[PDB]
Structures are given as structure tokens and as C-alpha cells.
mmCIF file of C-alpha atoms in Angstrom:
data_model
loop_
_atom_site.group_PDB
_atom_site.id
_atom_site.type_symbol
_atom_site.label_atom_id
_atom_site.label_comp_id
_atom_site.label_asym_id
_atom_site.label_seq_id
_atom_site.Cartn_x
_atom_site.Cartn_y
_atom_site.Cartn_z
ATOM 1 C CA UNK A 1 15.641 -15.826 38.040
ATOM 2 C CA UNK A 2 13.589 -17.619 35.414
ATOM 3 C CA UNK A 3 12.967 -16.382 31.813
ATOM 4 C CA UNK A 4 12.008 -17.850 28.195
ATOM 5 C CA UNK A 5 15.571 -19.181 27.935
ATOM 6 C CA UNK A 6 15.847 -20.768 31.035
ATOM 7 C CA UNK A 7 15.858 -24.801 30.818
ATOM 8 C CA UNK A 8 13.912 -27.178 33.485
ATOM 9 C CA UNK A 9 16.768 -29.517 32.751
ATOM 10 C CA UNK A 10 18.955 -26.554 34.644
ATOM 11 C CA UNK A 11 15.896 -25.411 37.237
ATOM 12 C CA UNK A 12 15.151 -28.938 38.262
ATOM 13 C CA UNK A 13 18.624 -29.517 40.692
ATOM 14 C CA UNK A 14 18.186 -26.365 42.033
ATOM 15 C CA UNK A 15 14.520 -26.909 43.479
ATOM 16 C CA UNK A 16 13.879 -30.879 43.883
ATOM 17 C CA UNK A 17 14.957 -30.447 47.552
ATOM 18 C CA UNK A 18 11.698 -28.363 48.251
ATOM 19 C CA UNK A 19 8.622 -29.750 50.078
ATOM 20 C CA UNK A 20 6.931 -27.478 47.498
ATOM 21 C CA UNK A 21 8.361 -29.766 44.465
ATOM 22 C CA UNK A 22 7.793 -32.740 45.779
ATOM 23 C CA UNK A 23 4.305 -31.644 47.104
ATOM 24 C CA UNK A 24 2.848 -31.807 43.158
ATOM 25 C CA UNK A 25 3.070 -35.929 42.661
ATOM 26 C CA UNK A 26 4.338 -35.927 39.213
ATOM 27 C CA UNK A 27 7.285 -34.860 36.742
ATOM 28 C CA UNK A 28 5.287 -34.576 33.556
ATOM 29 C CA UNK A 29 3.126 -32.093 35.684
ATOM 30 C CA UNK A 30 6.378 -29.985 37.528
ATOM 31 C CA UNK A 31 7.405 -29.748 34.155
ATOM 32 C CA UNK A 32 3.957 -28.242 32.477
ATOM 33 C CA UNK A 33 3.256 -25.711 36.028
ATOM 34 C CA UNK A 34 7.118 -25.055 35.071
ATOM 35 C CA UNK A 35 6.414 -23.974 31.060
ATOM 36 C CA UNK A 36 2.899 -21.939 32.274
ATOM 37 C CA UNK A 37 5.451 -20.245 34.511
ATOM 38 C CA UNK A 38 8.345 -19.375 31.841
ATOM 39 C CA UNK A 39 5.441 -17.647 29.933
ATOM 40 C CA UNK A 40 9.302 0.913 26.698
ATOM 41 C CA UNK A 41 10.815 2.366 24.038
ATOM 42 C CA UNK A 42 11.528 -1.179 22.022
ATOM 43 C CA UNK A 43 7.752 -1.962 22.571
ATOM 44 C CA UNK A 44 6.473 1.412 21.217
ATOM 45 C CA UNK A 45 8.403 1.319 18.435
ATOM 46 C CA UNK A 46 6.668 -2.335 18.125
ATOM 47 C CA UNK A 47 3.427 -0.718 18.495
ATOM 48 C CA UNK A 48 5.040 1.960 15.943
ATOM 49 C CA UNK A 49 5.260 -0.692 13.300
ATOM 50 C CA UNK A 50 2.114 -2.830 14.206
ATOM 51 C CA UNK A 51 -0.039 1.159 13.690
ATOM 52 C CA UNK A 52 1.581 1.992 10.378
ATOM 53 C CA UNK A 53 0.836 -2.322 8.945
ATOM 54 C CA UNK A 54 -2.367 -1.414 10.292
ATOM 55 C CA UNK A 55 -2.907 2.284 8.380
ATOM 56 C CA UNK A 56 -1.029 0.464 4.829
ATOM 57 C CA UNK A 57 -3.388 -2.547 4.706
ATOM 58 C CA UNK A 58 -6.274 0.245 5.018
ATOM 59 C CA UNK A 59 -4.504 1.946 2.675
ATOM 60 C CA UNK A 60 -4.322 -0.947 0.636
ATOM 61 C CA UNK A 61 -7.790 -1.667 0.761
ATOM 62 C CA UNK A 62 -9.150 1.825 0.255
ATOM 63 C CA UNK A 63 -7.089 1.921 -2.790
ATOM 64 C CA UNK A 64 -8.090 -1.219 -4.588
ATOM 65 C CA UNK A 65 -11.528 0.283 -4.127
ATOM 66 C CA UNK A 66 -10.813 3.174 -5.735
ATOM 67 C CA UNK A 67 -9.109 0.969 -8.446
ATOM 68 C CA UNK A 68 -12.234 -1.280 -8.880
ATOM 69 C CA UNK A 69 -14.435 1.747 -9.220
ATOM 70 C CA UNK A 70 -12.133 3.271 -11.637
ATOM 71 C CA UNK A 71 -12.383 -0.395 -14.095
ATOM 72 C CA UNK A 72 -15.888 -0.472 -13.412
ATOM 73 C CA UNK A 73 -16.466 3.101 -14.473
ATOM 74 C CA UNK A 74 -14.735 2.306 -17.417
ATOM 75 C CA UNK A 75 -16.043 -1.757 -18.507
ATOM 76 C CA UNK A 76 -19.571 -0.601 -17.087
ATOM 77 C CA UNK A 77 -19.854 2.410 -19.236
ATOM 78 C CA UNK A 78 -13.630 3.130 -21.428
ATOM 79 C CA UNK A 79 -17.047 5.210 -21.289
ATOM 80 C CA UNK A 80 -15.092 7.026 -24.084
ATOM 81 C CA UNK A 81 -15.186 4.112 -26.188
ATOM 82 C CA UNK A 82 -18.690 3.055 -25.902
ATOM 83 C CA UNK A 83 -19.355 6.674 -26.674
ATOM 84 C CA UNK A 84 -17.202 6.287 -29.546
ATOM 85 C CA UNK A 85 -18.720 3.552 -31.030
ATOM 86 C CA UNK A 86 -22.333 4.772 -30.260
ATOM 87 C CA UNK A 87 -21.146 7.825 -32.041
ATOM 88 C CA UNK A 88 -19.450 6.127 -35.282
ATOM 89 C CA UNK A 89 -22.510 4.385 -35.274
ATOM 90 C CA UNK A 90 -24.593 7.407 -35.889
ATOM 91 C CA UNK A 91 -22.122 9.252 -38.055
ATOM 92 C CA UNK A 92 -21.190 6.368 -40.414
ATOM 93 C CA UNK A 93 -24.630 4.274 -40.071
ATOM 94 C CA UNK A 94 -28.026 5.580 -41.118
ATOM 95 C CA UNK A 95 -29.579 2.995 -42.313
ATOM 96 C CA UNK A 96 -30.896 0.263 -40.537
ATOM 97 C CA UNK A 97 -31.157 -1.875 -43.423
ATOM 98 C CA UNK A 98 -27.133 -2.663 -43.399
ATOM 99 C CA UNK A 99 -25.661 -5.390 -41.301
ATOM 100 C CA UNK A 100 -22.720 -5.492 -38.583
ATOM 101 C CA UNK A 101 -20.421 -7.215 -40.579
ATOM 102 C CA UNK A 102 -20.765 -4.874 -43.859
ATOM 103 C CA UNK A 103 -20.331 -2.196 -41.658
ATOM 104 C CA UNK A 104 -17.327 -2.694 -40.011
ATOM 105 C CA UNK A 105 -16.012 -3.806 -43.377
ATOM 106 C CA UNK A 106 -16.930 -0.748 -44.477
ATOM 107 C CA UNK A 107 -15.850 1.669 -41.407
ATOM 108 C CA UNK A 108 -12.843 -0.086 -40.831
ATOM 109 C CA UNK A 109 -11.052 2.253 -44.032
ATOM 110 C CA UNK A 110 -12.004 5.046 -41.401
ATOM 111 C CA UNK A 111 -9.686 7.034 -38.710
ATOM 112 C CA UNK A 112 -12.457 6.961 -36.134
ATOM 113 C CA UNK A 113 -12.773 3.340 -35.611
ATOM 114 C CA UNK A 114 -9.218 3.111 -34.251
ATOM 115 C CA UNK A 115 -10.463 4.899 -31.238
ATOM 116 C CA UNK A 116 -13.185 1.485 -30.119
ATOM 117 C CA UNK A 117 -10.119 -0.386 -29.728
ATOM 118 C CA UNK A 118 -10.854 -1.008 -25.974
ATOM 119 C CA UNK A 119 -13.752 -2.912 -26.642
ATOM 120 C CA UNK A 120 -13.909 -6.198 -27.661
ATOM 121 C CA UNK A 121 -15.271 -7.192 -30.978
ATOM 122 C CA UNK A 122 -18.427 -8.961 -29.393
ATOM 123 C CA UNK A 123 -19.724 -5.576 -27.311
ATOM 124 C CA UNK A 124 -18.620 -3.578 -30.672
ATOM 125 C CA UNK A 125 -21.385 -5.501 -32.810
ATOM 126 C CA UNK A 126 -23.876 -5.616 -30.101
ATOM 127 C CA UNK A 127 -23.764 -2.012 -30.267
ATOM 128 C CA UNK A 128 -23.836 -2.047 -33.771
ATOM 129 C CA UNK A 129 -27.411 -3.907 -33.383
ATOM 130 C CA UNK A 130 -28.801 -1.999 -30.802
ATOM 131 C CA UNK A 131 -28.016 1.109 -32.930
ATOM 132 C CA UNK A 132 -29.539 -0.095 -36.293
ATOM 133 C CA UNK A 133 -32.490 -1.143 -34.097
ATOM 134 C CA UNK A 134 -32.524 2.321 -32.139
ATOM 135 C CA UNK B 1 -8.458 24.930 3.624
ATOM 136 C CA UNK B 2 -8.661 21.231 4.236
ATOM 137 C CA UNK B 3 -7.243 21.142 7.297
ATOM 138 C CA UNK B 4 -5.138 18.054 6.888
ATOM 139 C CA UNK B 5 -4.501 16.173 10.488
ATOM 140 C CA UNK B 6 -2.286 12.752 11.070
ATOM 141 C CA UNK B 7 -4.305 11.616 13.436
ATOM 142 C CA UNK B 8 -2.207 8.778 15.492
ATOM 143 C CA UNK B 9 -3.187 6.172 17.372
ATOM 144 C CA UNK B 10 -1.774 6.141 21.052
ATOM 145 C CA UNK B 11 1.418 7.636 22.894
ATOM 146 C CA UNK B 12 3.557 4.873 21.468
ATOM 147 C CA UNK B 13 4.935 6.965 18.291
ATOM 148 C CA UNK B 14 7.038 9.817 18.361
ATOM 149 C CA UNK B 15 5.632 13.410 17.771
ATOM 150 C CA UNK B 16 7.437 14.070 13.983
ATOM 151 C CA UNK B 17 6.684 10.315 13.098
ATOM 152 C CA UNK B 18 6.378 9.872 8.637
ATOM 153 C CA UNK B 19 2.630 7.846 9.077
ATOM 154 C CA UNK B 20 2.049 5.392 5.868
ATOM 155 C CA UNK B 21 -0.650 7.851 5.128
ATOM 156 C CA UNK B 22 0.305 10.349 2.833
ATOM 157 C CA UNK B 23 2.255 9.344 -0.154
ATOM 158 C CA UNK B 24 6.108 8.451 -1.570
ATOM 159 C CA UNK B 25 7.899 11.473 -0.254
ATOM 160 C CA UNK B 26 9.151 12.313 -3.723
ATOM 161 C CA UNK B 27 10.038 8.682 -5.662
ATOM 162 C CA UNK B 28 12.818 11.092 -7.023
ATOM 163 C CA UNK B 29 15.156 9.819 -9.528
ATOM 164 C CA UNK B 30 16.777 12.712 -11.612
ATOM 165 C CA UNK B 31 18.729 14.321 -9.027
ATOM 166 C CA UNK B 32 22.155 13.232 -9.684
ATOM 167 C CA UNK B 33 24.984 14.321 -7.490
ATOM 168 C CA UNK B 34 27.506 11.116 -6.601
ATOM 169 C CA UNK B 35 30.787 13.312 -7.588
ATOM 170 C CA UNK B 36 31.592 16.006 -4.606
ATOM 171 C CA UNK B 37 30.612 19.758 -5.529
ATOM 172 C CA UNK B 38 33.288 22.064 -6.250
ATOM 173 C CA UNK B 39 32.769 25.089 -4.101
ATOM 174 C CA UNK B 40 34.990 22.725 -1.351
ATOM 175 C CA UNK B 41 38.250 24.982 -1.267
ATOM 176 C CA UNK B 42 35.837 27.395 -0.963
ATOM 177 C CA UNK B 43 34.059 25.798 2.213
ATOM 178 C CA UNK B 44 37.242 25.068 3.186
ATOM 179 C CA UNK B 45 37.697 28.904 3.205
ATOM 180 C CA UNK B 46 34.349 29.174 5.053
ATOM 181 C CA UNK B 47 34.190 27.895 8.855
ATOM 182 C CA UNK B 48 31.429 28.196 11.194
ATOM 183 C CA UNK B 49 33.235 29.135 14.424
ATOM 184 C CA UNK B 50 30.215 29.871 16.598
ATOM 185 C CA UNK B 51 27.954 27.402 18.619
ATOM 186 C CA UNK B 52 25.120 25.425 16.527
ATOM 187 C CA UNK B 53 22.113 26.013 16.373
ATOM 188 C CA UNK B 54 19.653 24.160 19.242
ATOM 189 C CA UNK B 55 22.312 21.548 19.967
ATOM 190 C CA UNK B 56 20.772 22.055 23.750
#
């Protein structure tokens, strides 16, 4: 009655007597032929928790999609602050003849640049330029 | 009408099985009742001497 617990130190004096132990010419071997050999409801509740691993990493994974599109909706387009700034940019701005620098200086005494404060200084004046170009 | 279906795997599960599908249950917090209620003398007043309901 062998199992995974079961020692060859313990199996070995109950079997060396057998012409079928001593018909395999080695100990190291008995001993390997000996490990090969050693190897409802519990397993589908084991099945029960490899299924729902399996449906959270999907989840997972569906929802860090859904995530990226979300920050890339907003850094590709926070499409209401480009929108924002595009707009303060028409409102405030009419002349192309002023520069980025004199016009933030100047717009930052207004309300409605507060609401560009997602974007980063950098992407602020590049819209700034592309706006006095436009 | 979406028609919303927890579509398992194999036979393993039971039939009324919560699938990591759907969402928190509730992720309730504000319900508050550690102290016992006080309608006990009351339901002490108020046994239940017939058989239950599908205990068979």
C-alpha cells in the first residue's frame, strides 16, 4: 500500500526477498523505478478555485485595458484640457504677433487658465504656438 | 434586456456558485449594527412553533 509518504527506506525490507527485486541489478535503479512508482468534491472545489484565478486574471487584464484606453483618451487628446487651452487661446489671444511667454504672463491673472492644469507647461506653449500660427 | 448569463466552465462548481465576474457585492461600510436590536423581549414573545421552511 504505497503512497507519496511512503519511504523506500521502509519498502525496501519488505520486498528484497523477491526474484522480482533482485531481477533489476542495481539499488540506485530499485530506488528511481521505486520514486516513478510513488508518483471528488476536494478536487472540484480545486478546479473551483483554479476557474475563478482564471476568470480574475481576465478580469484583470480586460480592465487594465479599459484603464489604458481611458489615460490614452485623455494624454492623447484630459481632452477637456487641451480643449481648454485651445479655447483660452482663442478667447484671450488674437493676435499672432504676441509671444508664449507674454501671454501666459498675461492670462495667468485669469480664472480660465486654472482649468489647463493637467497639462504640462511644455504641451501648454506648444499649443500656444500652434495657435498664434493657426 | 441584456440577458446577463454566468457562463461556467465544467461540472466542477456548484449551481449558486458567486463567479469573480460581476463585481464587490456591495463594499458596504455604513451599516452599523454591533449592539443587539431591541425588539428581543419582544422575539422572545414571538416563537415559530411550526416546521421550517424546505429543511427536507
Amino acid at each position: 500500500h504505497l503512497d507519496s509518504q511512503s519511504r523506500w527506506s521502509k519498502v525496501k525490507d519488505k520486498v528484497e526477498s523477491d526474484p522480482r527485486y533482485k531481477a533489476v541489478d542495481s539499488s540506485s535503479m530499485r530506488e528511481d523505478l521505486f520514486k516513478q512508482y510513488i508518483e471528488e468534491k476536494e478536487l472540484e472545489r480545486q478546479a473551483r478555485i483554479e476557474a475563478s484565478l482564471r476568470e480574475r486574471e481576465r478580469e484583470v487584464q480586460k480592465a487594465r485595458s479599459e484603464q489604458t484606453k481611458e489615460i490614452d483618451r485623455e494624454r492623447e487628446q484630459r481632452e477637456e484640457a487641451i480643449q481648454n487651452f485651445k479655447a483660452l487661446l482663442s478667447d484671450m489671444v488674437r493676435s499672432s504677433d504676441v509671444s508664449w511667454s507674454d501671454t501666459r504672463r498675461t492670462l495667468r491673472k485669469d480664472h480660465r487658465w486654472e482649468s489647463g492644469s493637467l497639462l504640462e507647461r511644455e504641451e501648454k506653449e506648444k499649443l500656444f504656438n500652434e495657435h498664434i500660427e493657426a | 434586456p441584456n440577458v446577463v448569463f454566468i457562463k461556467t466552465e465544467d461540472p466542477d462548481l456548484p449551481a449558486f456558485y458567486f463567479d469573480p465576474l460581476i463585481n464587490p457585492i456591495s463594499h458596504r461600510h455604513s451599516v452599523k449594527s454591533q449592539e443587539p436590536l431591541p425588539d428581543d423581549d419582544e422575539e422572545f414573545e414571538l416563537p415559530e412553533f411550526v416546521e421550517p421552511f424546505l429543511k427536507d
